[model samples]
Target: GSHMSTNKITFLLNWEAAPYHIPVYLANIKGYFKDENLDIAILEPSNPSDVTELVGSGKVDMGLKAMVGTLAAKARGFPVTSIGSLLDEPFTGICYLEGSGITSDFQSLKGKRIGYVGEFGKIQVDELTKHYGMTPDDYVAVRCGMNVAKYILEGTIDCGIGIECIQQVELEEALKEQGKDSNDAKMLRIDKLAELGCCCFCTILYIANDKFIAENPQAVKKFLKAIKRATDYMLAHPREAWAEYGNFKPTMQTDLNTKKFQRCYAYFSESLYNVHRDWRKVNNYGKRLDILPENYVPNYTNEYLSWPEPKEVDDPEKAQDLMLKHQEECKTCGGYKRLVLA
Candidate 1:
């Protein structure tokens, strides 16, 4: 609590305020971090950003990253660790303007310009599309950075990568705001790409800067707990999570934005940070796509963490039995037993 003294946490977001990021912001908005004596300040990065450098350089305490990007960042920062997953699951989709002519066609989409937010998007276009029997000459993966929404909406580029959760929601809003047909916006989750054939690893990974973790263990533990609680609160108050982006500006995040934010948020857990299920994908694709090195598995998987593990008392009956057994062996009881023996 405050007895530990108030601590300051400057959290760097993977991107700007958006619907998918509500719980990260919700914690601060609902005063969940206050209990941990943390004053949280969330920072948004400029477009085409470098969160890894900024975070590892100690520019901030922590920041969120895409799962693939998270691994790369881990490689860059050996002592760094992923605190959790902000939005676990593939929220990314090829959300295109109706008639963007970017169907599931690697053949037709070859010559067309495409946009993507992070390095992962480039990987998808560069490597993932090869599954469609499309020639390398067919497509160009334009590094639009975070301009997926702008590029898609303005027709600046053909259909680009976007979040079914946040950007997809906002794209429709922007479409309607412009008197365009919102229904024309179509979101195709990445795994639908056929050859992809599995979990898209579309999770947003939260990372803690090593310097900060080493410097402040108590504060780190408290804030991590606060993050856990904040996520819980988001699940409990899903509507509230959506409405208060005005407060944090990203609370527009609902229960679910992909298939659905809050409803699916029920799935976010401490395990959300665990990437083993999808690790092979990132480890292999990350290397082939040139994002990670050959045979590189990010050290953050198990190396260093600043968060607390949950306690072990799951069975109260067992706990009571253990306690009673301990009490029987207590000093007084032992003294009596010894005296009787004497």
Candidate 2:
């Protein structure tokens, strides 16, 4: 156990406070970061893209953001690398009214105006269209923003791409507030984009600047250790984790949140963090859809992973078995397949 040098580290969140951020908050509130001998400040960015931009500018030591965003940033040469996975599984999909007569088959959306609010929305549309033997040029993409759900409910947009947990919770709450029941609403669903052979990463990731990793590898390992412990705590104690989450913000205590917490808990991992085994699946999907150039694999290294042994597995058979087993149990395994099409 090497003593960590004293240094202050800042972490930026991809969105405002919510249960989605509980793992990171748990680390802070439970003294996990302090246990690592690191001074950490967790903050919510005013803008969505600010997390990546700030890390790229070297103003922050790390940021929590969507895995796809990180890859896109890397493709554009941003100085960041994902050190761990938070959600460890895909939780996004397309939503439509129940009676919309929509099918999961991609071709059904041929003449539809799909609603999208984020970068992943565009990516999903592109992938689906291509899968149906169409092109993005074949449909209308409306930037409905926060009103995407409204558009779908009101029959304005044919379908909406949304986070399964957040959007579903919010939409259900809004419906309940209006004194409407599930039967009163019409909704259609589609397979997650990841299932469509698209390479997507976590909607959120733990990212550190390249320079920080270069300067303080051991500190990064300790930081990941803290995060892994927090995730474990989150999985081991759901009620307590939600209770702590409730403290972070009043909205987190909502019934929808409780339900969402129950549903999303299974997606969190207990093993080592930041293993993206499904990256290969995503790479293959991207190539098939022509969204990524052929032979473009995301450049990743074990430099930031906190593996127990840095170099002992010299036997190729032993190494293959270890790698395969890790991938089999990895929460983020096959997670990066399709976040977005374009």
Candidate 3:
């Protein structure tokens, strides 16, 4: 064999392992990362919020994070840049048991108990509920950390904030494991709430420190190429990829994981390229939610991504046409201007 050196990359995860993270695990398991001569050292922080600070401070080479939070970090010159997208749309939101009587009415949640992972989750629930014409005092809120699903099933809380692809899937899986119906869980997705006037922006992204990008631009490109290969492989053979993922983590081998994997395929990037419309949508939504700094400008680039640029839709100027249509329909959203971008 010929001698070849490998570049080391210290990568951080936004949270613990789940089906949504299968792409990264698949890359490592299938030797795709090795194929690129990238010896990635994946790190899982105890607190998911720690990922941004770790990556932005140059302690880690790259990490996965949500667009709003990363853009907020950019507003403060955190020295981080989002390089590639992992999910085309968001997976996090409010989830509940289907039989709990909570629906799009949003009024059904009144007088019921609600749970959240932390203060941030509470803030999301509060704002979204307020948008639907409800006050914070209408419902009881609890900080259930990462166990919102458990509380929901146990009847400790009527509904709670959680990721649809992870917690919601897990809740359904657990119900089936207990010989109950799997359709008992449902999710009220933030991105799909037309009344709230949100965009279908990329939810999860691969971010790296500015210094890391400058010093290891080629390495970054190679890393994305490797991930792109893994994504393609996963999409090509969903069952086979899930099997490899289960082999990588034996506990994940379950029918529920299979469904979760299938559901997540809808969120994977078309080719890892970051779309300008998607970024603009996220920037605008964040401003409306007040999650981003008032002066925040997007700090992301496609130079490190190995794929060709993405179109908003299959046709030209469709994104602009759709944005205008959406603006017309959401005029009652208190002058929330999700303006069309150039």
| After superposition, candidate 2 runs with Cα above 4 Å error | 1-7, 144-158, 177-200, 287-295, 299-342
Ranking by TM-score: 3, 2, 1
Task: Write down the lDDT of every candidate, Cα atoms only.
Answer: 0.62, 0.64, 0.73
Residue lDDT tens for model 3, 192-290: 653333334427888999899999888888888989898888877777887889987886797666666655555567578777776877777677767
Shift of residue 315 alpha carbon in model 1, Å = 26
Question: Each candidate's TM vs. the true structure?
Answer: 0.74, 0.76, 0.82
lDDT of 1 by residue, 71-184 (tens): 777666644567666665544677776776666455657677778886767666667667778755677777787777777778777877876545665576677778988667
RMSD of candidate 1 to the truth, in angstroms, is 14.4
Q: What TM-score does model 1 achieve against the real structure?
A: 0.74
**After best superposition, candidate 1 residue 237: deviation in angstroms?**
1.7
Q: How do the residues 1-342 of candidate 2 rate in per-residue lDDT, one tens digit apiece?
A: 898865688888887665668888888888999998977888787666567767866888887876666665655566787776676544455665444666656666777888887565587567667556899998888876566767776778887776655665556656677786643332233334346322244436778888887888988888888887887787777778779878767788887666556545545545534554455555555555455567566634445556553232235345334433443333223221111111
- Using lDDT as the measure, which candidate wins? 3
What's the residue-level lDDT of 188 in candidate 1? 61
Instruction: Rank the candidate models, highest lDDT first.
Output: 3, 2, 1
